[PDB]
Amino acid sequence: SEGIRKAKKGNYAFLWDVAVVEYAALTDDDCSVTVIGNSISSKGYGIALQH
Amino acid sequence: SEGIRKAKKGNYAFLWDVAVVEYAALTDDDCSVTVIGNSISSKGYGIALQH
């Protein structure tokens, strides 16, 4: 939440999930941001369960 | 095993696994290798166990 406006106001590139940044681009009332892609497909994300 | 030097000595944009190319251009010694990038998240490989 601080990284919303501090990246808006201040040259701060952030370290986070891209899909969140996709939605943060989806929320800003002006198209006023920039993202750069990432491709690391050897490691994945699964969903935990009962052992 | 067929279209090997036809991609290197002919107009054939041959199409296979990138890691196989990291073996094949390693077998190549003539510096006639060029390739572009690709990000495909859906498919891949991990060793099967017993059921």
Swiss-Prot record, chains A, B:
It comes from the Eukaryota. Belongs to the glutamate-gated ion channel (TC 1.A.10.1) family. GRID1 subfamily. The chain holds residues 726 to 776 of 1009 of the full protein. Member of the ionotropic glutamate receptor family, which plays a crucial role in synaptic organization and signal transduction in the central nervous system. Although it shares structural features with ionotropic glutamate receptors, does not bind glutamate as a primary ligand. Instead, forms trans-synaptic adhesion complexes with presynaptic neurexins and cerebellins, regulating NMDA and AMPA receptor activity and influencing synaptic plasticity through signal transduction. In the presence of NRX1B-CBLN1, forms cation-selective channels that are proposed to be gated by glycine and D-serine. Homodimer. Interacts (via extracellular N-terminal domain) with CBLN1 (via C1q domain), and more weakly with CBLN2; the interactions mediate the trans-synaptic adhesion complexes also with neurexins and are required for ligand-gated cation channel activity. This is Glutamate receptor ionotropic, delta-1. It is found in: Postsynaptic cell membrane. Highest in the pyramidal and dentate granule cell layers of the hippocampus. Ca(2+) 2 binds at D28, D30, S32.
